[PDB]
Amino acid sequence: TMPRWVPLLLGLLGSTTCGMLLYAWSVFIKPLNAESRAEIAMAFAICCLIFGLMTFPAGRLSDKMGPRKVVMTGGVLLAIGFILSGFIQSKYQLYITYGVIAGFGGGMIYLPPIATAPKWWPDRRALATGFAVVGLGLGSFLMGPLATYIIEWRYVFWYCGVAMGIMALIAGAFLEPPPAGWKPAGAPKVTRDWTYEEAKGDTKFWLLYLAYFCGSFAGLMVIGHLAGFGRDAGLTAMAAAGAVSSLAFSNAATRILSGWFVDKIGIRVYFAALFALQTAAMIAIFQLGGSVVGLSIVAIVIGWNYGAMFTLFPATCLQFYGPTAQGSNYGLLFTACGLAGFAGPWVGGWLKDTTGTYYLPFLCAAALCALGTAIVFMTKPPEKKHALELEVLFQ
Ligand SMILES: CCCCCCCCCO[C@@H]1O[C@H](CO)[C@@H](O)[C@H](O)[C@H]1O
């Protein structure tokens, strides 16, 4: 067969493509306005919504007809979205090309590897999931110098769309679960994995859904405000921007480190702790946000907690319901993050504008993270289902 570490590289490739898709709009804000920032951000909001919703059908189709078809279709759709975003002329044009097509393909690329990589690593599920999701923290590090090299804009859309289509087709080409019988390794009761209908009907699934929505919303609601908070406190734009930039490093690193850490010690308490820490960070920025060092610390903590969500929620869902229906279960679960990605940033901006001050959005995010802390800490796994219909066999 093939080594079980190959799916990790595949998910790295696919998630890196998705990260390039998500990082594109920030590089395009200035060039596109050259020919309103909020008008541009509407395309990104559409992209987030489409992405986060298309995970659900992507997960169902991955569970039904395998993940290769889904990821490669996603690569086609995204590549089309980017290459067509390159040939745009109107606002709605970019909305469709980037937000819808590219977002569609991006969701279809993102989900199947998150579902597949743990299947090869039953001994290290959270780490493998982290490899399936760590590419999104990379999009900035690879694209930003690349995008600057191309511009210093349509060239970015076209060539990046080609490269992303290629990486996604490579990742999806070699992507498939292990064979049904044997699992890569080095009268009784027979348990079994939950069905998608059994998981979707479970109450803890929606407690996790609610926690996910809250965490994603709070993070997306304040991250855009971190550097503006620093400038309001008295820092120079350069200093505040430098301070907030460490959030990318922590957001990327946490996806692998938290995965490995909970593989070793368990999910629930570390996860709840990270949420608590995010709560404290939303509150603490008011004391630490006015100096490069303090603002950097808050950005790192926000990045760590936020990023950890995207390993720990799929790892938690895998713990609860098992991996056979993980495509459907986590695809459904991720739509929470899709909705938050649509609405959260706008709400943060609106609250700040409404009051003129940062207390309201940060305090609202702290409340959401408190709720998430409570849910994540108090939710223990459900009863492992038994296959009585398979149990009967031991005479
Ligand atoms: C952003 C917050 C969104 C919270 C959504 C909570 C949904 C709770 C009600 O849903 C229903 O729950 C049943 C089992 O509990 C399922 O059988 C059913 O399919 C589902 O429709």
Residue numbers in the entry: 7 to 41, 45 to 161, 167 to 200, 212 to 420
Provide text from the study:
To understand the binding mechanism of L-lactate that bound to the purified, detergent-solubilized transporter with a Kd of 2.84 ± 0.15 mM, we co-crystallized SfMCT with its transported substrate. Two molecules of L-lactate (i.e., Lac1 and Lac2) were found in the binding pocket (see also Supplementary Fig. 5c,d for electron density and omit maps). The carboxylate group of Lac1 interacts with the Nη nitrogen atoms of the guanidinium group of R280 (TM8), while the hydroxyl group is hydrogen bonded to the hydroxyl group of Y119 (TM4). Furthermore, the carboxylate group of Lac1 is in hydrogen bonding distance to the hydroxyl group of Lac2. As observed for TSA, the Lac1 carboxylate group is sandwiched in the confinement formed by the side chains of L145 (TM5) and F335 (TM10). The phenyl-ring of F359 (TM11) points towards Lac1 with a distance of 3.4 Å between the C4 carbon atom of the benzene ring and the methyl-group of Lac1. Most residues involved in ligand binding adopt similar conformations in the SfMCT structures with bound TSA and L-lactate. The exception is L28 (TM1), which is rotated away from the central cavity in the presence of L-lactate. This removes the binding site obstruction observed in the presence of TSA and generates space to accommodate Lac2. Neither Y119A nor the conservative mutation Y119F showed any [14C]L-lactate transport, which is in line with our observation that the hydroxyl group of L-lactate interacts with the hydroxyl group of Y119 (TM4).
We have identified a transporter from Syntrophobacter fumaroxidans (SfMCT) that shares 25 and 27% amino acid sequence identity, and 51 and 57% sequence similarity with the human SLC16 family L-lactate transporters MCT1 and MCT4. In summary, we reported two structures of the bacterial SLC16 homologue SfMCT in complex with the monocarboxylates TSA and L-lactate. We have presented the structures of an L-lactate transporter (SfMCT) with two different bound ligands. Both structures show SfMCT in the pharmacologically relevant outward-open conformation, which is an essential prerequisite for the design of L-lactate transport inhibitors using SfMCT structure-based homology models of human MCT1 and MCT4.
